Paper text:
However, full-length hAQP10 yielded no crystals and we continued with a variant (hAQP10cryst) truncated in the termini (Δ1–10, Δ278–301) that crystallized at pH 6.0. Strikingly, the region typically linked to selectivity in AQPs, the aromatic and arginine (ar/R) selectivity filter at the non-cytosolic end of the pore, is significantly wider (2.6 Å) than in previously structurally characterized AQPs, as also found by HOLE analyses. A single glycerol molecule is instead located adjacent to the AQP archetypical, central NPA-motif (N82–A84) in hAQP10. F85 has a side-chain configuration unfavorable for glycerol passage, forming a unique mechanistic feature. Moreover, the entire cytoplasmic pore region has adapted a tight arrangement not previously observed, achieved by the first part of loop B (G73-H80; loop layout likely allowed by the hAQP10-specific G73G74-motif) with V76-S77 capping the cytoplasmic opening, F85, and R94 (of TM3), which seemingly stabilizes loop B in the closed configuration. Notably, HOLE analysis suggests that this narrowing (0.9 Å) permits water (0.8 Å at the ar/R filter in hAQP2), but not glycerol (1.3 Å in AqpM)16 flux, in agreement with the proteopolymersome data at relatively high pH. Nevertheless, as the obtained crystal form contains the entire hAQP10 tetramer in the asymmetric unit, intermonomeric differences were analyzed. While overall highly similar, three chains display an identical, closed, cytoplasmic arrangement.
Here, we report the crystal structure of hAQP10, the only human aquaglyceroporin that becomes stimulated by pH reduction, in agreement with the altered cellular conditions observed during lipolysis in human adipocytes. In contrast to other known aquaporin structures, hAQP10 displays pH-dependent glycerol-specific gating at the intracellular interface, rather than flux governed by the classical selectivity filter. Specifically, we identify H80 as a critical part for this regulation, being the pH-sensor that propagates structural rearrangements leading to the opening of hAQP10, upon double protonation associated with low pH conditions. Our combined analyses reveal that pH regulation is achieved by a cytoplasmic, glycerol-specific gate and, likely, a widened ar/R filter, both unique to hAQP10, correlating with intracellular acidification of adipocytes observed during lipolysis.
Author numbering:
A (entry chain A): 18 to 268
B (entry chain D): 13 to 268
C (entry chain B): 18 to 269
D (entry chain C): 16 to 268
Write the structure that this text describes.
């Protein structure tokens, strides 16, 4: 079954993406920042994307991201009827990787918290799994952040995926994508941590909702949960339109 | 039916796109470090991000063969006869405009963080100054002379490298990796000669955003600060590109 | 017959691997973290794998790791009867490279330790050579940690080596492996370092046993020493069986 | 320039000059900023970037040598005439001396601000080590000599292996990048004892600069007379490294 094969690729790639991304936050948090910090988190996040894109068969393979799946539907490369299935698989995979992360870091989490799982405050561990905005950040500014960041990402991915573009060399495309993730992380990561990917954010938030952290994962940050869902989708639409226009202006 | 037939228009669009990306990533990383109280960025993160921005922007621009992104490089391309002189004012203006616009986007991207960091007080010098998010300012100890030399050298070295990567009489680095190697050059320059004044090496990258901060809340001190520093990142890199290009060219002439 | 050349490549590669890896820990610990830290240790271990793999003739050359050698047997690329030879050579090279590190950092060890060679305290230097778990880590968590990390490394190496995949540009395979090791170190290095390699751990632990640290190197961490030996082997087996199942799933 | 030796000397001067500007530049950036613009990691990283840039400048690994130790290796394998060895070393030495003056000028204002004009070799505000290397205070001469024999021997074996057109190694056009990875690995694993000068010209030439440029004879007496270890020990490392490389090739063929 082709759909099944496509679904396997999404599940595998999102799983590896999420393990490495979340593991790097758990490493920094539960170690008191003696084995990780903000830079380590951004770098491991960009290496996670490089590796996951390889796992998924490169940029032309798995999407790993509802935002990118939307972009593929817009340009005609993925049938609209398959979009919910992809997003479902990507969400489930991120949910499952959060469980793997929880088990990988069980002793470290227990040691750091004494078993007290919190969303805010000095020992909070909710942000190992999903993102939370900086304390100063309004919903509007956060929405803008993650329209711009995701639209930049999407235009970069589409230009790499576009075979008529002379860009990066065969077999290195995931490495350059990793470079862009790093650049975005270090230049646009301060407001709310470049989730850039609604499955990357909602799947794990749901995991922490049911695995001990409770409803505050949805009320925290002024109801922040829906911004990493909606804004990347807006960013993918605007980014796909921008890219399609640029192509039209060029030939 | 939307195809741009004019070559000049296509070239201008590339300048605009590449400079815009270069400047968003470059200024964003300074803003991230500054506004976060250095908990989300720092000097190293700024130097690394600025060299990543160059790599990414040169890909966006069509590799080193495509967009210039830099009035100093555009001068070099004229000097070696690859850009008609008459197009040079057009390129520089589009570069300036793109950098100005990208500063606007940075300002909107970091509005809440700026307000929180400054309480609304937009200063150019002092513990909480934020003008250096957009344009570059010299260390307090630096004279114009030393600052001038610093930018002549940094920019001259950059241009010579770009010329060597471009020159097809050389063996060249692998196709599709030029931008990565340019990025590595930018990183090296930032860690070895970025202390005096933040290595702008690009008049558009500096003046455009300085003009933005002039009108967007920082006032005329952006032009008086540093003993009238604003003109050094304009003139010195152009002097550096001229000396670098002349140096590259006789070296080549010297081996023929 | 290429057995002797195959052994030489294992010995050379492991030796560069261990010098660079251990040196970076010694540089960090011994300088009071003024010339190294957790991050340079993880990055140095990445560079070391990249350099050692070039030295060993790239991913299809020296194995450098009992867990990869085990994977080569399972998939039928290394004869089972050579597995004990490769592991022995890998173990011996890691033991010798620890001697080289000790000599390299002789004055710095004495300055850091005043001659007191311990495992566990504030001036402990045993973890320059072999890996010890975080104080909170149970043997269960540490075992799972190594099984997962090594399994991920091995799936990555299999996919790079497998010529049915489109591949990574020729002569950059080692650089991409190094990026995986960096990713593993930053995302799952906190529990017990990322030995990922039985010879890289047991070889040097044997060295510290006889070179001055004593039997504590085997009782510390609730008898930690066997976990970096057995867990990467289980990870190699589980990763290999997973790579082969996925693959078979895409064939008839 | 019709003279072959002339063009070869020019290549050595230009390569070493860039190597030194970038290498010393990063130490001045870290020291004179009070480590707000650089630190130990930055110095190691910029050192490794300087080498790959300078090796490009020189025409890749099969171009300029940039290093008395590597030229000795080239003489031993017959790829460079012995009678040209004192010439190469002298040009490498003088390039490093000239590059140190460029560093002093580039960082003139930063140096005055940091020292108040008192140039010292030891103590809280010493600036001598911007230009040349000094050993960790705990290090004996013997241990530093071993440190530089091993570090340089490993560098030389890597470089010979890359030069050796019989080896499948790095993609054409990226050999200087992999050498720079090597220099970073060496800096992070073996840079604590005395930096990783690995290069007699990189060390002596700058030391002679600071000697005449205001730091005085103490650059030669500091570190229990340390100055000759980064001169002699890389030469022994190159010799040992070259024999080792030749042994290993023979062991395969
Ligand atoms: C664990 C660290 C590195 C693992 C790297 C795996 C690289 C090989 C992946 O190839 C792709 O796998 C997809 C499944 O996801 C399939 O759809 C298939 O088409 C194939 O082309
Ligand atoms: C799998 C899709 C289902 C996800 C739905 C989870 C969101 C449930 C709504 O939670 C509420 O969100 C408000 C913001 O609207 C917050 O103010 C807060 O009070 C919170 O209680
Ligand atoms: C990262 C943002 C940049 C995305 C821009 C996508 C534009 C695609 C350009 O296509 C190329 O345009 C040339 C003319 O310019 C043509 O001759 C032809 O070669 C065509 O294939
Ligand atoms: C993040 C890395 C992205 C790699 C590939 C992006 C570049 C692909 C298109 O580039 C170039 O767009 C220029 C406009 O800027 C045009 O002039 C056009 O001729 C085109 O060729
Ligand atoms: C780190 C950035 C430094 C700038 C890179 C310089 C690019 C010039 C590439 O051309 C050639 O690369 C060849 C490899 O084959 C070498 O032989 C060398 O002769 C040179 O002619
Ligand atoms: C429209 C593009 C040009 C941008 C701004 C033009 C120059 C602004 C000049 O400002 C003045 O420059 C003097 C010279 O350094 C300083 O001493 C100080 O008096 C400053 O107030
Ligand atoms: C920092 C480095 C910048 C200086 C650039 C020096 C360029 C040297 C001139 O080119 C060289 O001319 C040789 C003979 O004319 C050719 O055989 C070929 O080798 C070519 O590469
Ligand atoms: C700084 C790293 C530079 C490395 C440049 C290339 C290294 C070449 C390694 O050669 C390999 O040596 C193996 C012995 O270990 C042998 O098995 C042999 O087959 C050979 O292929
Ligand atoms: C203590 C365990 C640590 C290393 C693992 C040892 C693996 C032993 C495998 O033996 C081999 O099994 C093959 C298939 O099972 C058989 O074909 C046969 O060739 C036999 O020789
Ligand atoms: C489950 C997938 C198993 C795939 C394992 C087989 C890997 C193929 C080995 O590669 C080959 O190794 C040679 C040396 O042995 C090299 O010289 C080169 O020719 C290379 O192509
Ligand atoms: C740091 C990440 C390390 C993982 C490297 C993963 C294996 C790379 C093998 O080559 C890749 O094979 C894929 C499967 O065919 C293709 O999709 C193609 O794009 C190609 O590049
Ligand atoms: C050259 C390598 C030799 C192989 C090393 C394996 C021997 C390890 C045994 O440790 C023993 O653990 C005891 C705990 O009961 C200690 O009290 C003491 O008896 C010690 O001897
Ligand atoms: C060639 C491999 C030989 C290595 C043998 C190591 C000796 C075994 C370690 O001794 C004991 O292990 C116990 C449980 O593991 C610990 O609780 C502790 O009491 C320790 O002293
Ligand atoms: C920061 C500046 C980066 C410039 C990189 C320049 C790389 C091109 C240098 O090519 C080589 O120049 C040698 C002179 O040194 C000559 O011998 C000649 O044979 C040529 O092949
Ligand atoms: C630090 C690296 C150690 C150097 C080891 C080099 C000796 C191996 C030489 O033979 C290797 O094998 C084949 C011929 O033997 C070819 O592939 C050849 O080009 C080389 O690869
Ligand atoms: C080719 C140029 C050679 C440069 C070196 C020549 C000067 C030697 C330095 O003099 C003395 O060296 C003694 C030997 O260690 C030290 O004890 C120390 O007191 C120092 O004063």
């Amino acid at each position: 079954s082709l759909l099944a094969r496509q679904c396997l690729a999404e599940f595998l790639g999102v799983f590896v993406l999420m393990l490495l991304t979340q593991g790097a936050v758990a490493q920094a948090v539960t170690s008191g920042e003696t084995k990780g910090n903000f830079f380590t988190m951004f770098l491991a996040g960009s290496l996670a994307v490089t590796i996951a894109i390889y796992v998924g068969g490169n940029v032309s393979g798995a999407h790993l991201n509802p935002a990118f799946s939307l972009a593929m539907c817009i340009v005609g490369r993925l049938p609209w009827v398959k979009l919910p299935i992809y997003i479902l698989v990507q969400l489930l995979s991120a949910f499952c990787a959060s469980g793997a992360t929880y088990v990988l870091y069980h002793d470290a989490l227990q040691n750091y918290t004494g078993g007290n799982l919190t969303v805010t405050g000095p020992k909070e561990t909710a942000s190992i799994f999903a993102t939370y905005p900086a304390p100063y950040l309004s919903l509007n500014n956060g929405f803008l952040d993650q329209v711009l960041g995701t639209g930049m990402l999407i235009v970069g991915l589409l230009a790499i995926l576009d075979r008529r573009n002379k860009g990066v060399p065969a077999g290195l495309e995931p490495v350059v994508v990793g470079m862009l993730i790093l650049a975005l992380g270090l230049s646009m990561g301060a407001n709310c941590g470049i989730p850039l990917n609604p499955a990357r954010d909602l799947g794990p938030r749901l995991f922490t909702y049911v695995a001990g952290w409770g409803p505050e994962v949805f009320s925290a940050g002024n109801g922040w949960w829906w911004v990493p869902v909606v804004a990347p989708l807006v960013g993918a639409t605007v980014g796909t339109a921008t890219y399609q226009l640029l192509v039209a202006l060029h030939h």
